[PDB]
């Protein structure tokens, strides 16, 4: 039962060196038939999979062309671990980073020429920001829309609820966006009947655990 | 080797047959082609390796076919767990390795136009020195939508950010926010703020607007 465990700092200031290590459990570094391939892969926000680099059983190391200068891949065979370093990180390097086990074996072993085991990944986010609670501003209203703008916080996540979490029907809490300032921002909206704006109170409850921010914000129609 | 997947988005109902395509820029042997499934927030998962062989534990409804420069992943009867992203990969005799750009398999449903709402910056935010304007597109299908910001009839560019929800579990629609950011100073120099929405469900673009400072 092979497993990969990954650790390393995921919140990086720009120009720092990303450093990740994976630990192998259930398999040896080379393998019974000297076929193991230890690989690094990243997934930028909203984009597909991009191969980064590999160190194989024989110690051969190879990198993708666009990263070969800035990246280093290594292994500590004594501890069944392998690592990735990536220097001078920028917004371009924000991604989820995975390690994975592949094999090129030459009863055939399972998953030959495939990446069958993956770590849980590390979300790597590049920002010069420190921990910061969000500002919460109202987005004021047959159907009426209202919401809250949850702006300028770091890092993820924020939880947003409406009336303490009772209200979820018609609620849309949008995936946060990283602004150019290094700070996140998102909005949470709900569509409600116009005829309820005078009988039902609408409050957005915003929790940001990293800053211990807790904000209850009544969103009322403007007059 | 450049792997090009098509279609970008595949829209189907549960139980239908799904056919996903991966075209290589050059001929490659089937030994070196693999397929992966990935749901958001989760690591990828190997489905097929060596073109046609299922990985351990993979259900019989997944199968592979093809040769030469075109390979195919077929799902014979989509189950709710199968709506996800799919990637092909070229794992040859040596690095470098390449992935396709991905295909998304979504739930098909009838076209739905978005409801459009615009929100001026709140007085609380303006007191802070920033001005954010939010355009909301509620419960629409398909996901493809165009949102253009106009300020005093000038098309805005590079000062807006979009966010889209995942497909709804109840009605299979999407929702989208577009946020236009300007300094409080620039916000007060202009009068008409408008977001123009184009979507397959609208017979013509819908514009929602406000005049700065009007009740």
What is the three-state SS of A112-170? CCCEEEECCCEEEEECCCCCECCEEEEECCCEEEEEEEEEEEECCCCEEEEHHHCCCCC
Q: How far apart are CA B72 and CA A115, in angstroms?
A: 19
Q: How far is A79 from chain B (nearest CA, A)?
A: 24
Q: How far apart are CA A115 and CA B49, in angstroms?
A: 9
**Residue A46 phi, psi (nearest 5):** 70, 10
Between β-strands B192-198 and B45-49, what pairing exists: parallel, antiparallel or unpaired?
unpaired
Residues A10 and A112 in one domain: yes
Chain A stretch 37-66, residues whose beta carbon is closer than 8 A to a beta carbon of chain B: 39, 48-51, 53-54, 62-65
Check: CB of residue A50 under 8 Å from CB of residue A41: yes
Q: How far apart are CA A42 and CA B51, in angstroms?
A: 23
For A170, the domain range is: 135-218
Within an 8 Å CB–CB cutoff, is residue A33 touching chain B? no
Structure tokens at B201: 């469900």
DSSP designation for A10: -
Domain chopping of chain B, boundaries: 3-107, 115-211
Q: Give residue B82's Cα distance to chain centre.
A: 17
Residues A25 and A120 in one domain: yes
Residues A67 and A165 in one domain: no
Cα distances from B199 to residues A34, A145, B165, B172, in angstroms, run 55, 19, 16, 16
Q: Give residue A79's Cα distance to chain centre.
A: 27
Strand partners, A216: A205
* Cis peptide, bond prior to residue B142, ω within 30 of zero: yes
Residues A24 and A65 in one domain: yes
**Which residue is listed with tokens 């009863």?**
A107
Q: Which of A60, A174, A215, A221 to mutate to test the interface with B (most CBs of B within 10 A)?
A: A174
Sign of the CA dihedral with B123 first, then B125, B126, and B128 last: positive
In a domain, A118, yes or no: yes
Residues A54 and A107 in one domain: yes
Distance linking the first and last C-alpha atoms of chain B? 59
**Residue A195 phi, psi (nearest 5):** -70, -5
Which CATH number is A201's domain given? 2.60.40.10
Strand partners, A76: A81
Check: CB of residue A147 under 8 Å from CB of residue A204: yes
**Residues, chain A:** 223
Check: CB of residue A162 under 8 Å from CB of residue A192: no
Tell me the CATH number for domain B3-107.
2.60.40.10
Q: How far apart are CA A146 and CA A189, in angstroms?
A: 6
Question: Is A121's CB within 8 Å of B85's CB?
Answer: no
Question: Is A147's CB within 8 Å of B43's CB?
Answer: no
Q: How far apart are CA B178 and CA A90, in angstroms?
A: 25
Residue closest to B16 by CA, chosen among B86, B100, B105: B105
Select from A126, A159, A191 the last residue of a domain.
A126
Q: How far apart are CA A24 and CA A21, in angstroms?
A: 10
Distance linking the first and last C-alpha atoms of chain A? 64
Residues A161 and A198 in one domain: yes
Residues A141 and A106 in one domain: no
Q: How far apart are CA B28 and CA B106, in angstroms?
A: 29
Q: Is A17 helix (H, G, I), strand (E, B) or coil?
A: coil
Q: How far apart are CA B204 and CA B140, in angstroms?
A: 15
Structure tokens at B92: 């040859």
Q: Which residues in chain B are closer than 8 Å to A139, comparing Cβ atoms?
A: 119, 122, 134
Residues A47 and A66 in one domain: yes
What DSSP string runs through chain B? --EEEE-SEEEE-TTSEEEEEEEESS---GGGEEEEEE-TTS--EEEEETTTEEPTT--TTEEEEEETTEEEEEEES--GGG-SEEEEEE--SSS--EE---EEEEE----BPPEEEEEPPPHHHHTTTEEEEEEEEEEEBSS--EEEEEETTEE--SSEEEEEPPPPTTT--EEEEEEEEEEHHHHTT--EEEEEEE-TT-SS-EEEEEETT--
- The resolution in Å comes to 2.0
Total structural domains within chain A: 2
Burial class (CB in 10 A: 0-12, 13-18, 19+), A11: middle
In a domain, A223, yes or no: no
State the CB neighbour count (10 A cutoff) for residue B96: 15
Residues A102 and A140 in one domain: no
Question: Is B46's CB within 8 Å of A115's CB?
Answer: yes
Residue A109 CB contacts under 8 Å (≥ 6 apart), including other chains: A33, A35, A103
Check: CB of residue A187 under 8 Å from CB of residue A134: no
In a domain, A97, yes or no: yes
Question: Is A175's CB within 8 Å of B89's CB?
Answer: no
Between β-strands A36-43 and B130-140, what pairing exists: parallel, antiparallel or unpaired?
unpaired
Between β-strands B85-90 and B33-38, what pairing exists: parallel, antiparallel or unpaired?
antiparallel
Residues A144 and A74 in one domain: no
Q: How far apart are CA A141 and CA A152, in angstroms?
A: 23
Does the domain spanning B115-211 belong to CATH 2.60.40.10? yes
Residues A151 and A47 in one domain: no
Cα distances from A71 to residues A20, A101, A199, in angstroms, run 11, 19, 59
Residues A115 and A9 in one domain: yes
State the CB neighbour count (10 A cutoff) for residue A122: 20
Q: Give residue A56's Cα distance to chain centre.
A: 27
């Amino acid at each position: 039962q092979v497993q990969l465990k990954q650790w390393g700092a995921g919140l990086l200031k720009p120009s720092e060196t990303l450093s990740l290590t994976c630990a192998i459990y259930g398999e040896s570094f080379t393998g019974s038939w000297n076929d193991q391939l230890w690989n690094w892969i990243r997934q930028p926000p909203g984009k597909g999979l991009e191969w980064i680099g590999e160190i194989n059983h024989n110690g051969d190391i190879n990198y993708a062309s666009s990263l070969k200068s800035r990246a280093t891949v290594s292994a500590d065979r004594s501890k069944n671990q392998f690592s990735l370093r990536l220097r001078s990180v920028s917004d371009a390097d924000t991604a989820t980073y995975y390690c994975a086990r592949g094999r090129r074996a030459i009863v055939e072993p399972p998953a030959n020429y495939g990446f069958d085991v993956w770590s849980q990944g590390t979300p790597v986010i590049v920002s010069s920001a420190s921990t910061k609670g969000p500002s919460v501003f109202p987005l004021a209203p047959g159907t009426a829309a209202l919401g809250c703008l949850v702006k300028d916080y770091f890092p993820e996540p924020v939880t947003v609820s409406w009336n303490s979490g009772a209200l979820t029907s018609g609620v849309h809490t949008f995936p946060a966006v990283l602004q150019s300032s290094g700070l996140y921002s998102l909005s949470s909206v709900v569509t409600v009947p116009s005829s309820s704006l005078g009988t039902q109170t609408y409050i957005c409850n915003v929790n940001h655990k990293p800053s211990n921010t807790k904000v209850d914000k009544r969103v009322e129609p403007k007059s | 080797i450049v792997l090009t997947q098509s279609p970008g988005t595949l829209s189907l109902s549960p139980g239908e047959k799904a056919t996903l395509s991966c075209r290589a820029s050059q001929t490659i042997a089937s030994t070196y082609l693999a397929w992966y499934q990935q749901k958001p927030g989760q690591p990828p998962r190997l489905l097929l390796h060596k073109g046609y062989n299922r990985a351990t534990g993979i259900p019989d409804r997944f199968s592979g076919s093809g040769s030469g420069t075109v390979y195919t992943l077929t799902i014979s009867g989509l189950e709710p767990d199968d709506f996800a992203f799919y990637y092909c990969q070229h794992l040859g005799t040596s690095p470098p390795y390449t992935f396709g750009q991905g295909t998304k398999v979504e739930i098909k449903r009838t076209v739905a136009a978005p409801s459009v709402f615009i929100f001026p910056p709140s007085d609380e935010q303006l007191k802070s020195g920033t001005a954010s304007v939010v355009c909301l597109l509620n419960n629409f299908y398909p996901r493809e939508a165009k949102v253009q910001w106009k300020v005093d009839n000038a098309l805005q560019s590079g000062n807006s950010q979009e966010s889209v929800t995942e497909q709804d579990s109840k009605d299979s629609t999407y929702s989208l926010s577009s946020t236009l950011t300007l300094s409080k100073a620039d916000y007060e120099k202009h009068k008409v703020y408008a977001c123009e929405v184009t979507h397959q469900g609208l017979s013509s673009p819908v514009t929602k607007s406000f005049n700065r400072g009007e009740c």
